[PDB]
Amino acid sequence: KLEAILSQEVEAEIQALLQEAEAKAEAVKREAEEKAKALLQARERALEAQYRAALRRAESAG
C-alpha cells in the first residue's frame, strides 16, 4: 500500500545517519587512545634520559 512507501523513505536515512555517527564515535575514541599512548611514550623516554645523565654525573663527581 501507500503507507508502506512512507516507512521506506525514512527507514534508510535513519540507518545512513546512525551508521555515520557510530563511526565518528569510533574515530574520536581511536585517536583518544592513540594520543594517551603517545603522551606516555614521550614520558617513558624522558625518565630514561634523566637516569642515564644522572648516573654519569655521579660517577664524574665522585
Partner: protein, 50 residues
C-alpha cells in the same frame, strides 16, 4: 481518463481524491516525493495540467 493514466503510470501507491463543488470536480493527486516527474508526465499525456 486521468485516473487510468495515473494508475498505469504510478501503480497503486498514488492517491486520487476528488470532492465536488457543483459542476466538475477539483481533483487532487497526492504522490510521493521524487515521484513528481512521473506524476506530471501522466497529467500531461491526458492533456490536463496543474
Amino acid at each position: 481518463l486521468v485516473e487510468e493514466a495515473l494508475r498505469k503510470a504510478l501503480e497503486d501507491r498514488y492517491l486520487l481524491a476528488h470532492e465536488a463543488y457543483a459542476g466538475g470536480v477539483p481533483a487532487l493527486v497526492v504522490v510521493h516525493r521524487k515521484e513528481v516527474d512521473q506524476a506530471k508526465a501522466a497529467l500531461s499525456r491526458a492533456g490536463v495540467a496543474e
